Amino acid sequence: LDSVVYLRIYWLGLKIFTPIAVLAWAVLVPMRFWTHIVMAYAFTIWTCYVLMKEYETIANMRLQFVASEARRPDQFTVLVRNVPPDADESVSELVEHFFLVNHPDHYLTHQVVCNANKLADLVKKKKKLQNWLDYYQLKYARNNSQRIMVKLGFLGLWGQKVDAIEHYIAEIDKISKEISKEREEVVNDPKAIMPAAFVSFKTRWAAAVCAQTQQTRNPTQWLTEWAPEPRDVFWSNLAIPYVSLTVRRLIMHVAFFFLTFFFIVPIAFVQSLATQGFLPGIALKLFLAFLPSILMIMSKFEGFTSISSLERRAAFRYYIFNLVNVFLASVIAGAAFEQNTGEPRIQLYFLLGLVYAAFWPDVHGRVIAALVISQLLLMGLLGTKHAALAAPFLIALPVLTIGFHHFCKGRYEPAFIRYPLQEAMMKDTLETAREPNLNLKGYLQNAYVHPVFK
Template sequence: MLWNRRMSLKLMLVKHEDALLGMQLNFGIGCVAVNSYMKISVERERVANDPKSIMPAAFVSFKTRWGAAVCAQTQQSRNPTLWLTEWAPEPRDVYWHNLAIPFVSLTVRRLIIAVAFFFLTFFYMIPIAFVQSLASIEGIEKAVPFLRPIIEKKFIKSLIQGFLPGIVLKIFLIVLPTILMLMSKFEGFISISSLERRSASRYYLFNFVNVFLGSIITGSALEQLNTFMKQSPNQIPRTIGVAIPMKATFFISYIMVDGWAGIAAEILMLKPLIIFHLKNFFLVKTEKDREEAMDPGSIGFNTGEPRIQLYFLLGLVYAVVTPVLLPFIIVFFCLAYVVFRHQIINVYNQEYESGAAFWPDVHGRIIGALIISQLLLMGLLSTKQAAQSTPFLIALPILTISFHYYCKGRFEPAFIRYPLQEAKMKDTLERAREPHLNLKGYLQTAYIHPVFKSAEDDEEEEIHGKWEHDAELVPTKRQSRRNTPLPSKFSGSSSPSLPEVVEERGQP
């Protein structure tokens, strides 16, 4: 008994010492965290009060829509470069890194990027054409002749001829969206939507030159460049028109590799799933960390929209020449509609609201695809026995261009300028319906750099976001999961069962 008492007292002393040590460690960690936050706060105040940190850009808020429309759409001074005004993007859409770029350097930056994109587009064709030449049966047998017995097998031969060129082309285009986005950021656009619009335009142009034209013109890389350089411009549609039917098989395999497989990868979301499990294993400590790790992001307009328009171009070109390609494109569009509709409603978060600013660019590329398909059809028919009826097709591109200019003059101003009549009408209705509406408190913290926002501002944003979610007429499944009142057991692998929840709520 005495020995047992001594051992119990010793164990109690050891436990007590461990508890004191844990309290000391926690106290030390808390002091380090407080000191770190104090240093960040002092540095924030220093930068905010430093005159050298003032940027030549500002966000101006107005009491009325009419005043904002007048200021944003008029010239403010006699010198047009003294005061430059434009519509500000919404707070979520601001790309803060480019606000400090001087106006004078924007033109130089865009000229540099235009030249760089030209060389990127045409010199990117050389490695693509070289690798695609090796991806053929003859190219592989010439490069590695000891593999000829394996390549000549029927299954391997059909696989190489059907899918290998499309897979090689897809691999070469993986890093391209990142490069184009970096080039757009260097140009100095101040909104995320503008960055994605410029990147999407260049991605579509790149695909048109390298994927469409580069794949149609057969031969090596230098032969492709010489084909465009040595021919007269009026012979290019005829050359491409002759080569179009012979490349239908390649584009069918490319649609299956890039389009069908891309839609399957979109619905599976393997990359976000792997990233979530890595973050969950190494970084997640709290429920907020888990929610951030589960964030799927937003839909990539800079990559998805140009790819869909490329398939639209292929459908227009091959609708008359080789209609066998149309079922593959129709299947892609049907699958894309179902999958992207599900992803937008139930999975992705809306990163910003740009007011349908993408549509003028999309409309212009659709018109361009129509004109290209009509010119290539004329070039193809000029080589056949129907050459005498080809001149009658000249009316098609003329009518298409006329329709484009009509739409441009009739509808494009609605995407660029805000009518003063509409602004005045909405101001009058707002004063009549909500006379005590005051947005001053929201506007004071809306356009503050995220680094300078305090904890109070973050709480106000959370309350404002919760109010927006509550005001939605049709909540999505993802929002319903976020706003669930049931407690989340982030340490476990499954949700709590109903008896556990009832027991927890029944406790005082």
């Protein structure tokens, strides 16, 4: 806000000047390594202190900035995931019994997610295949080309697809009544339901309590969490087989790091040379790809349940990849030759112009990421000296920055929690005073059904 505007004037100067100086002055002028390391430490501690002060100011602005919205579902609901299956009771009965025993006199109702897995699959192929047929007919009118992947690539149906219009229309008509009979089945079927649910409480207090606590002696079951907006929930990931989200996120770190390291390799070989046979040209044509969307899909292959979170994670990965390759390699090549939508765009424009001359915690994460990348790549640049033996004393700098980041985590992030207990209770009391004749149950028991299900 106002403080962000005030501090950005001093902030931009340091931001443009911190990587360029370390790139140029460190290789241009030869007390050599001592000066280099001491200047690096001075800059990194200056940045750390600036972040800490600014982030105290932002936290205080948050505390004074307390205001109200009207009300919404996900102000009362949580997303109980990975409900354990039982042969004797359906998911609805299990959820109801659990939340009547272990959270009594606050639980209101639960809306179990329908077995949308095949449902979401069929809806998604429905939409993408009508779109597919549309622009492919347009393309065939423009450029008559034949595809060799009929919607599956590997193990598609043994058909002909001479028309692909009437056959698909008939399949859609049949699957409509198939969906109808499945709808009739799910109301009494104990296996046509995914293991997840949206649980609604009488109060914000209860939902906050239920979102922050452990629910069972098995931290992989009844895995509770703040529910998204009914428009914002990503219906596919609700019932991932849950192969240990911790493992699922570790795999993402590793795969992303190898992806970026692999993409560094061609540029490294190009710089080393400039210091089958024709397939490299096709590869260079392909390196301009939709890869942003590739990362988005790649994390979508993992589970976050909310479109906002998926977009945030994809944007962060794309940010770090951009800042590494299209910035640091570019500026090092330039040095060798010498010898919240408008905000990221204006960042890119200001960086490009200077080449020739609760979102704030995310911003903090990005700045810390930039500092860590700078430090690690300077590490790689300077490690060429054999038998330096300065490493067990010089390596600590990324570790120190990560320690400071965790200090900031534990010291200021808890100021952006949704509904700490005091606020939830105060909102409850005020709302009850304002609207003492509110049938809350009727209001909150119709959302989180499905976009398809009316």
